[PDB]
Design a protein around this ligand. Structure first.
Ligand code: FMN
Ligand code: SF4
Ligand code: SF4
Ligand code: SF4
Ligand code: FES
Ligand code: FES
Ligand code: K
Lengths: 263, 44, 432, 214
């Protein structure tokens, strides 16, 4: 009734008012690249990896944040869209450390996998990289903040879901840093969830450090029994041993979060 | 009456650190009542 | 009929009659110079009439973008829901080379304060927040003193000018961030957060300061509104070419004999502006290397183009640059043009807010490359690499600062590539 | 040069004594009433600056105080202090010399002004003299480009400087007095040196050029 018709690569899709370009593309099975957007956090629109071309529009729009207007044709695979992604991926990897072998995120990194699919295959950065100081926010989350890509997922999660306004951005420009400024431990019952939402190896699990790589773990879908919520989990095993516990999505029980005791 | 050889803006030579806020405080009596969103803060 | 040459504006047609502070800036000096005259009639005329006068006036924003003011101010001329409506006056002048807004505040404060009321009445706003950068402490105090005089005279506040319209004027000081000149970063700073621009949509006219409808107008764009309403839109539109009408404030700075701020008609040829008001280039017009027509954000142009180029939005677009804030930065042949523009990239690296990737990581990247072009510690194949890097920042960023960092580099490569490659050849010979 | 992480030190920590004077609490009450009810966080920038004017700089205790007065989480105050450059998170000299060095001031030999101060005070850029009297830093455009190399001391602009003139300002500041602010080359403002080129006729009084309808 109140749906409006938009086009994704020419294919018609009916969407509700206020639906974003990123969400319109989901209905046709297309997943726009992303680093800062999470469907359970507020929109930020800072990583700029979701830039997509709209036919007849000179300027690329941010799919995560741009509401889709009636009659728009979203070009998710045009040259302008492909060049936009390679440009953003080039900037995103410019100051990034060559830590993949020693980084716990290697093999399940949203920066690695979107560099292989949407970025360029080589570097033209001839300068010196930027290194940053490491914060200590507790005995659960290990912070190697040279890997941070300033996406602010942890900031929005710690604030909107855990209700703890202890993480923020200090500095400005290329020296902007995510942290607590003061020496403070991020100890909430949901603190361990910033490990998952962080798309890079900046925030990893200290108990799990260096113990496994994602490809070699076997995934068993089970139920948490630490409380009466019955959270759905994934039990990661390797060679007969339990390596870690990850959340498993369930919209009606736990969404994609678990408590620290469960984790 | 057409004196144009004098810089008629010299008051600021004597302004002090708290000059700006003192003027702001003196203006509070003229302000109209502020609007209210309906809550004491976004966190309430 | 329509004019063919522009310039030589008469003092009988200059809006800012106290641009140099030679008269009394306080009230009763502004009134003697035509301010606060017959303001009640303008307010009682109606918001539609005021907007109609600004639309016919052809006035365009003096902040650096030059959008049609009359069209923009009509977005707030809509039915008022429960939320209040504000007007934000952008006195955060921080664009390198720009000083016009500093003079309006410290010498003609009552023109700005009247413009707030006239602009507010057009937009149906309840109050005006004037954001002025924190380094303009003395200027902000002058503005605050003038606002007190207006309140005591009944000009603003309860029943402004006897019009029956309530309007407050608040002055808010920034804390030293050039990015807070952006219309959405300025709003965030007023709300007590970091000066990080928002994405659009929503536009400030639908969701702005405190989440309420808002319009961000530059100091010059507002200070001229009362005069336009008094003298009509026809008088203001009679200046400059079509779609470039009005009288503009210019800041000639750099390598000139008499660096000054002066008001001059739109479309005035750049050569006439420099020679007539600034006393020519240092060393003679033949000693001119390049000019930045509208502050650092605009790309430079060489001597060959300055001889027949008019100073207006349309004329400078055909020259691969922009009018910007009408700040003219002149560089003579003794200047190190590569180092002049490299320091401009270093400026943007220091003012980038860090929010978004292409400017947090790109403008810093362009800084390091430029710092190696000054010394020639690069090979010529990097010039085209620097051209592409700039094109990946331009239009891929949240705000226009990322475009403002790319454009200076593009102008340098466009008009001074031989100087770049010569510099690298010198370095290669020595360190062979 | 300025780190953005706070490590506690004896002179800077949550226990360092800070509290607004009774006079400032009256000023804060006027500031907090410039904004709609329910948006007190809008007062962070003014109040956080008012703390610096009283104290000269912002220790970690000063930030925590503004957080509780406005009822905002302390981190949201740390973000503002670290974002803006006019906030001093370390002690500075009572005279903070800020020499503009952006291109328009650079083209008019602002390097000579910088050399003049470094020789006279014997300090490098970013250092404080060994008497807590002067601190020197380079800053971006201060909005006075039309004026030749200019500096800012605290709240005053000293314009059209030359290496000779800037040294006099330091001498005048050194003993007891506050030098007059503004150009130091015979000008008064942005006016063109060598005689005005515009606004040379008596300004027209009220009611001039007014259209018939209005
Ligand atoms: C990085 C940056 C800095 C800006 N600084 C200013 C400024 O200092 N003063 C101003 O009036 N506009 C400035 N602008 C332009 C504003 O975004 C916006 O165009 C202006 O506030 C609208 O006023 P107008 O109607 O006069 O054009 C800046 C834009 C950017 C991207
Ligand atoms: S975060 Fe990803 S790209 Fe960066 S070092 Fe770790 S695995 Fe490699
Ligand atoms: S630490 Fe991770 S989640 Fe937080 S801003 Fe950096 S990349 Fe994003
Ligand atoms: S372009 Fe630069 S200044 Fe503008 S929002 Fe992005 S990071 Fe901030
Ligand atoms: S996913 Fe849209 S800018 Fe980050
Ligand atoms: S460049 Fe120095 S005041 Fe503008
Ligand atoms: K992670």
């Amino acid at each position: 009734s109140n749906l409006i018709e938009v086009f994704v690569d020419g294919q018609s899709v009916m969407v509700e008012p206020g639906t974003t370009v990123l969400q319109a593309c989901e209905k046709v099975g297309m997943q726009i690249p992303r680093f800062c957007y999470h469907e359970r956090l507020s929109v930020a629109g800072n990583c700029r990896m979701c830039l997509v071309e709209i036919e007849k529009a000179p300027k690329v729009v941010a799919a995560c944040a741009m509401p889709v207007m009636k009659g728009w044709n979203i070009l998710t695979n045009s040259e302008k869209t492909k060049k936009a992604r390679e440009g953003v991926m080039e900037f995103l990897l410019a100051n990034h450390p060559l830590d993949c072998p020693i980084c716990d995120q290697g093999g399940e990194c949203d920066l690695q996998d979107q560099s292989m699919m949407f970025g360029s295959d080589r570097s033209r950065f001839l300068e010196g990289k930027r290194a940053v100081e490491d914060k200590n926010i507790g005995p659960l989350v290990k912070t190697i903040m040279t890997r941070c890509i300033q996406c602010t997922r942890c900031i929005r999660f710690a604030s909107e879901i855990a209700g703890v306004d202890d993480l923020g951005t200090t500095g400005r420009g290329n020296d902007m840093q995510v942290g607590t400024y003061i020496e403070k431990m991020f100890m909430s019952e949901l603190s361990g969830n910033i490990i998952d939402i962080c798309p890079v190896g900046a925030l990893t699990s200290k108990p799990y450090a260096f113990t496994a790589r994602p490809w070699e773990t076997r995934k068993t879908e089970s139920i948490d029994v630490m409380d009466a919520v019955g959270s759905n989990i994934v039990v990661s095993t390797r060679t007969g041993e339990v390596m870690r516990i990850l959340p498993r999505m369930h919209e009606d029980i736990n969404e994609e979060w678990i408590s620290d005791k469960t984790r | 009456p057409f004196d144009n050889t004098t810089y008629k803006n010299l008051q600021h030579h004597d302004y002090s650190t708290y000059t700006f806020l003192d003027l702001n405080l003196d203006l509070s009596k003229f302000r109209m009542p502020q609007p209210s969103s309906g809550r004491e803060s976004p966190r309430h | 009929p329509k004019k063919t040459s522009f310039g030589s504006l008469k003092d009988e047609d200059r809006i800012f009659t106290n641009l140099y502070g030679r008269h009394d800036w306080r009230l009763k000096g502004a009134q003697s110079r035509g301010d606060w005259y017959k303001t009640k009639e303008i307010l009682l005329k109606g918001p539609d009439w005021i907007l109609g006068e600004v639309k016919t006036s052809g006035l365009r924003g003096r902040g650096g973008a030059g959008f049609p003011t009359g069209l923009k101010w009509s977005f707030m001329n809509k039915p008022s829901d429960g939320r209040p409506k504000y007007l934000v006056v952008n006195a955060d002048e921080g664009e390198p080379g720009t000083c016009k807004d500093r003079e309006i505040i410290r010498h003609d404060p009552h023109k700005l304060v009247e413009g707030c009321l006239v602009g507010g009445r057009a937009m149906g706003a309840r109050a005006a927040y004037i954001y002025i950068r924190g380094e303009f402490y003395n200027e902000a105090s002058n503005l605050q003193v003038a606002i007190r005089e207006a309140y005591e005279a009944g000009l603003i506040g309860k029943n402004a000018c006897g019009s029956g319209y309530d309007f407050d004027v608040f002055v808010v000081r920034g804390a030293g961030a050039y990015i807070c000149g952006e219309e959405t970063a300025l709003i965030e700073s007023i709300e007590g957060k970091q000066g990080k621009p928002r994405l659009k949509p929503p536009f400030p006219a639908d969701v702005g300061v405190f989440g309420c409808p808002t319009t961000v107008a530059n100091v010059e764009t507002v200070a001229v509104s009362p005069t336009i309403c008094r003298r009509g839109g026809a008088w203001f539109a009679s200046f400059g070419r079509e779609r470039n009408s009005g009288t503009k404030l210019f800041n000639i700075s750099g390598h000139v004999n008499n660096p000054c701020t002066v008001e001059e008609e739109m479309s005035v040829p750049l050569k006439e502006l420099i020679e007539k008001h600034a006393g020519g280039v240092t060393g003679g017009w033949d000693n001119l290397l390049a000019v930045i027509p509208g502050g650092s954000s605009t790309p430079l142009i060489p001597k060959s183009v300055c001889e027949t180029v008019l100073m207006d939005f349309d004329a400078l677009i055909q020259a691969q640059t922009g009018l910007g804030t009408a700040a003219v930065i002149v560089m003579d042949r003794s200047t190190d043009i590569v180092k002049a523009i490299a320091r401009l990239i270093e400026f943007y690296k220091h003012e980038s807010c860090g929010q978004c990737t292409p400017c947090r990581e790109g403008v810093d990247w362009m800084n390091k490359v430029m710092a190696r072009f000054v010394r020639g510690d690069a090979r010529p194949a990097e010039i085209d690499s620097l051209w592409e890097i700039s094109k990946q920042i331009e239009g891929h960023t949240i705000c226009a600062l990322g475009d403002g960092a790319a454009w200076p580099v593009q102008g340098l490569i466009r008009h001074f590539r031989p100087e770049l490659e010569e510099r690298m050849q010198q370095f290669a010979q020595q360190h062979q | 040069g300025a780190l953005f992480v706070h490590r506690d030190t004896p002179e800077n920590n949550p226990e360092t004594p800070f509290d607004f004077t009774p006079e400032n609490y009256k000023r804060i009450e006027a500031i907090v009433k410039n904004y709609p009810e329910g948006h007190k966080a809008a007062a962070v920038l003014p109040v956080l600056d008012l703390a610096q004017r009283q104290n000269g700089w912002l220790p970690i205790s000063a930030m925590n105080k503004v957080a509780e007065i406005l009822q905002v989480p302390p981190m949201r105050v740390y973000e503002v202090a670290t974002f803006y450059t006019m906030y001093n998170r370390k002690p500075v000299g009572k005279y903070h010399i800020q020499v503009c060095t952006t291109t328009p001031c650079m083209l008019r030999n602002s390097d000579s002004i910088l050399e003049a101060i470094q020789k006279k005070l014997g300090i490098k850029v970013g250092e404080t003299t060994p008497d807590k009297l002067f601190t020197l830093i380079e800053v971006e455009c201060l909005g006075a480009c039309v004026n030749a190399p200019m500096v800012q001391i605290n709240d005053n602009y000293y314009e059209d400087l030359t290496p000779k003139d800037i040294e006099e300002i330091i001498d005048e500041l050194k003993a007891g007095k506050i030098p007059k602010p503004g150009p130091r080359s015979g000008r008064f403002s942005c006016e063109p040196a060598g005689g005005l080129t515009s606004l040379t006729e008596p300004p027209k009084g009220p009611g001039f050029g007014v259209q018939a309808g209005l």
